[PDB]
């Protein structure tokens, strides 16, 4: 629960290069995107609104719970945006791995087996 730390800002800064669209013909991820995605995920999964994931493991738990909810209740433009936004924050932010688009981050998140729930 700390979206004010300097490590948090560096994570967002890394994700500033990532595009929401599949090409160079789109927007760039902003800090508002991630705060919205995290908050929307916390409320949906019985977490406190302002709970900020510190480690990668914490974020994966949120993503797993959110994807599970999408599997049970259904998909939508909002919940898909939230899930992919967290995955971008996971790959390009915490792991610091260069991805061009959100689709690339989504693809890297799966290949590295991050979809699997930790223990």
Residue numbers in the entry: 2 to 120
Q: What is written in the article reporting this PDB entry?
A:
Matrix protein (MA), p15 in FIV or EIAV and p17 in HIV or SIV, is the N-terminal subunit of the retroviral Gag polyprotein. During the viral replication cycle, the FIV p15 matrix protein oligomerizes to form a closed matrix that underlies the lipidic envelope of the virion. In FIV, HIV or SIV, the N-terminal domain of Gag undergoes a co-translational covalent modification of the MA N-terminus with a myristoyl group. This myristoylation, together with a highly basic patch of amino acid residues located at the N-terminus of the MA, directs the Gag polyprotein to the plasma membrane (PM), mediating the association between Gag and the inner leaflet of the PM lipid bilayer, where Gag forms a hexagonal network. The structure consists of five α-helices (numbered h1 to h5 following the HIV convention), which give rise to the close packing of adjacent helices typical for retroviral matrix proteins.
